[PDB]
Design an enzyme around this catalytic site. Sequence first.
Site, PDB file in Angstrom:
ATOM      1  N   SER A   1      50.928  28.051  62.273  1.00  0.00           N
ATOM      2  CA  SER A   1      50.983  27.802  63.700  1.00  0.00           C
ATOM      3  C   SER A   1      52.294  27.101  64.133  1.00  0.00           C
ATOM      4  O   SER A   1      52.602  27.110  65.301  1.00  0.00           O
TER       5      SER A   1
ATOM      6  N   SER B   1      46.861  26.892  70.397  1.00  0.00           N
ATOM      7  CA  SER B   1      47.391  27.737  69.324  1.00  0.00           C
ATOM      8  C   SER B   1      46.807  29.148  69.401  1.00  0.00           C
ATOM      9  O   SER B   1      46.251  29.689  68.439  1.00  0.00           O
ATOM     10  CB  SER B   1      47.146  27.094  67.965  1.00  0.00           C
ATOM     11  OG  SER B   1      48.173  27.430  67.037  1.00  0.00           O
TER      12      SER B   1
ATOM     13  N   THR C   1      50.736  21.600  65.217  1.00  0.00           N
ATOM     14  CA  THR C   1      49.951  21.818  64.007  1.00  0.00           C
ATOM     15  C   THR C   1      50.091  23.255  63.495  1.00  0.00           C
ATOM     16  O   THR C   1      50.493  24.173  64.222  1.00  0.00           O
ATOM     17  CB  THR C   1      48.479  21.523  64.278  1.00  0.00           C
ATOM     18  OG1 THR C   1      48.084  22.158  65.506  1.00  0.00           O
ATOM     19  CG2 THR C   1      48.220  20.020  64.390  1.00  0.00           C
TER      20      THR C   1
ATOM     21  N   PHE D   1      47.961  25.884  60.273  1.00  0.00           N
ATOM     22  CA  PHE D   1      46.909  26.001  59.258  1.00  0.00           C
ATOM     23  C   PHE D   1      46.884  27.466  58.838  1.00  0.00           C
ATOM     24  O   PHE D   1      46.536  28.328  59.648  1.00  0.00           O
ATOM     25  CB  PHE D   1      45.562  25.555  59.834  1.00  0.00           C
ATOM     26  CG  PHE D   1      44.371  25.773  58.938  1.00  0.00           C
ATOM     27  CD1 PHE D   1      44.427  25.512  57.580  1.00  0.00           C
ATOM     28  CD2 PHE D   1      43.157  26.174  59.482  1.00  0.00           C
ATOM     29  CE1 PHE D   1      43.312  25.690  56.773  1.00  0.00           C
ATOM     30  CE2 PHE D   1      42.039  26.350  58.681  1.00  0.00           C
ATOM     31  CZ  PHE D   1      42.121  26.110  57.329  1.00  0.00           C
TER      32      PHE D   1
ATOM     33  N   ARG E   1      45.676  16.435  58.200  1.00  0.00           N
ATOM     34  CA  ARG E   1      47.048  16.837  58.494  1.00  0.00           C
ATOM     35  C   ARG E   1      47.659  15.969  59.589  1.00  0.00           C
ATOM     36  O   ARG E   1      48.884  15.826  59.658  1.00  0.00           O
ATOM     37  CB  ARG E   1      47.099  18.316  58.897  1.00  0.00           C
ATOM     38  CG  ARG E   1      46.603  18.618  60.294  1.00  0.00           C
ATOM     39  CD  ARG E   1      46.527  20.119  60.554  1.00  0.00           C
ATOM     40  NE  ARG E   1      45.696  20.374  61.719  1.00  0.00           N
ATOM     41  CZ  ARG E   1      45.533  21.559  62.291  1.00  0.00           C
ATOM     42  NH1 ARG E   1      46.165  22.617  61.793  1.00  0.00           N
ATOM     43  NH2 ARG E   1      44.745  21.680  63.337  1.00  0.00           N
TER      44      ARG E   1
HETATM   45 NA    NA Z   1      43.735  18.452  63.239  1.00  0.00          NA
END
Ligand code: NA
EC number: 3.5.2.6
Lengths: 246, 247
Positions: free
Chosen positions: A49, A97, A188, A190, A232
């Site tokens: 992302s 995202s 962020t 993932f 994270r």
């Molecule tokens: Na998070």
Amino acid sequence: MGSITENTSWNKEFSAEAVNGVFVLCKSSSKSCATNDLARASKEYLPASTFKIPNAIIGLETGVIKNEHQVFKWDGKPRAMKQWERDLTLRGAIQVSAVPVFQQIAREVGEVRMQKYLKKFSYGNQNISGGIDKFWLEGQLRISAVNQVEFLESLYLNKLSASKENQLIVKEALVTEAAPEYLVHSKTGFSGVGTESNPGVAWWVGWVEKETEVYFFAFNMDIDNESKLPLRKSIPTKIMESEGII
Amino acid sequence: MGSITENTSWNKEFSAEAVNGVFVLCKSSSKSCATNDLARASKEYLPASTFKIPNAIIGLETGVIKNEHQVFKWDGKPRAMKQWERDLTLRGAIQVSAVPVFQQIAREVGEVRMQKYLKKFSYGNQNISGGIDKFWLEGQLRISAVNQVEFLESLYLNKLSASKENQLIVKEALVTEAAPEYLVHSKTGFSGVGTESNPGVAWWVGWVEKETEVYFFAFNMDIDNESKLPLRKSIPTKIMESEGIIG
Ligand code: NA
Ligand code: NA
């Protein structure tokens, strides 16, 4: 970037959670960075992302994204998350995202222009092969934590190969915490839970403006279970709180 | 703005705190504003600290402020607030409302250019009499809550007579709350306690970006005691919470 120096005082924040990962923190500039793990700091991982940052800049530079008030309309067809099933601004799409919004941006940018800009940005291994709408999700693109903080520093300084206006637009879309004393920009990522003996990666990258100082940061970790995802943010947040930055 | 309507639903937030004031809230998509007090929404008050918004834009446009990374250095001479006794960025100076930084900006802009830009911006009564470094705090400049939201809408749209770059720079300096679902840009103002007979004014102005909607807002109130100053944010926050915009 200059030297990367190892700081052992942060390992406790990782060990407490049995996390294999890295934090890179640079005060003022990428000339002087600190990390818990010299080797992992420069190891390259799928950006997931976090790729929305260059993708947004490239979208604006090519005119695929018209300006910062463009609305990305939902066509009403199913999307993988309910939070994506609505019209979104650029900031909105970044903050939730919304993968499908950026997949269409990437398709319209196209492979030739995408390659050109990742070369200009010195963005990781610059490998976009295998599918223009998924190379950052499951492809061969890789970038390190050190490279992330170099890229973010360029964005902060308006020194990417893009107009200042477009860099400012993307920076406003990345604001995630505002206080009178400090401002956080971040994103962020993932990749997923990986496969057997091959964990996924989770990221948190950004920068902090505090008084007249700036701190660039990038965190990544191995992850094979979604219940670990909040680490994270919490591990780097705890490190930056103990440094007195936030 | 397209229309304005008076709404009584909000009075309870003022009466609960015995405040005499006005809130104006405008929805961009419907080009529609609402207010608790149409008369007061049109009354013109010293902008006080809210003037840092046009002053910052003008400083950038004229080159007095180089860019968003310029540092305003503290000379070490004592200032009225300890929180101002340090080097400050543009955002920092706006966020702590550092009066002496913006007094010097105004001096360097100068009367002729300041007048030109307030005309371009349609900013209040455009009267900068009273001293180049104090006209917005103790001078003759006056602006209404309706004018504030008109001005802020132009800034949000990058339609002020300034480069988009400089409007974007000032907008970033004005961010005061960030959440995944909404972003608040805002600025406070306070002219002082005035007198018992003739109170000062306190302001909170700004806008909220939520989903694809944008809400422009301006609040002001009479104030004669600094202990009431937090009400300038809490009353409009409670109103915008009850409308479902923030919180
Ligand atoms: Na998070
Ligand atoms: Na989808």
